[PDB]
Amino acid sequence: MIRFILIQNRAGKTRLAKWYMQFDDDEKQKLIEEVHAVVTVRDAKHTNFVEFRNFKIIYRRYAGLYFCICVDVNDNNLAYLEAIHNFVEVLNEYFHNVCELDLVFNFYKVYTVVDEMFLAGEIRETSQTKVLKQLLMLQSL
């Protein structure tokens, strides 16, 4: 399953954090710092599948942004990497060439999208067309 989803910048400021397991604020901050430290050191030649405590992290870089999903050791890697890319594509389509400021100024809509695709630590919906239609219908209200 999925433990948490993070969208971060290079400077370390967390742009989005979704948690699917119980944690405290200090523990959450420590985990965020550890994830940032682990992801930043690695270069582009390295793999995207990095062990982290007793889980693993599937991460992708988009310019100055880092998208991270923390999953169990026995879970599939390529499927969740493509889930990351699908999520990024839908974010780009919905925000009309999304940028970092778009995520900053519309955190609640991003939370709605993340709930639409990921729920209870699993993949909920995969189609871009249906997700976009639902989001447009909600925005029409």
Give the residue among 61, 69, 114 at the shortest CA–CA distance from 91: 114
- For 39-82, strand residue ranges (E) read 49-52, 55-62, 65-71
Query: Nearest approach, Cβ of 23 to another protein (angstroms)?
Result: 7
Q: List Cβ neighbours of 76 (8 Å cut-off, separation of 6 or more).
A: none
Each residue 26-65 as x (binds another protein by CB under 8 A) or -, in order, gives xx--xx-------------xxxxx-xxxx-------xxxx
**Out of 129, 132, 135, 136, which residue is the one contacting another protein (CB under 8 A)?**
129
By CB under 8 A, is residue 105 in contact with another protein?
yes
Q: What is the CA radius of gyration of the chain?
A: 15
32/26 Cα distance (integer angstroms): 10
46/44 Cα distance (integer angstroms): 5
Each residue 64-103 as x (binds another protein by CB under 8 A) or -, in order, gives xx----------xxxx-xxx-xx-x---x----xxxxx--
Number of residues that bind another protein (CB under 8 A): 58
If one counts every other C-beta atom within 10 angstroms of the C-beta of residue 102, the result is 16
Binding residues for another protein, rule: CB under 8 A, are 10-11, 23, 25-27, 30-31, 45-49, 51-54, 62-65, 76-79, 81-83, 85-86, 88, 92, 97-101, 104-105, 107-108, 111-112, 115, 119-127, 129-130, 134, 138, 141
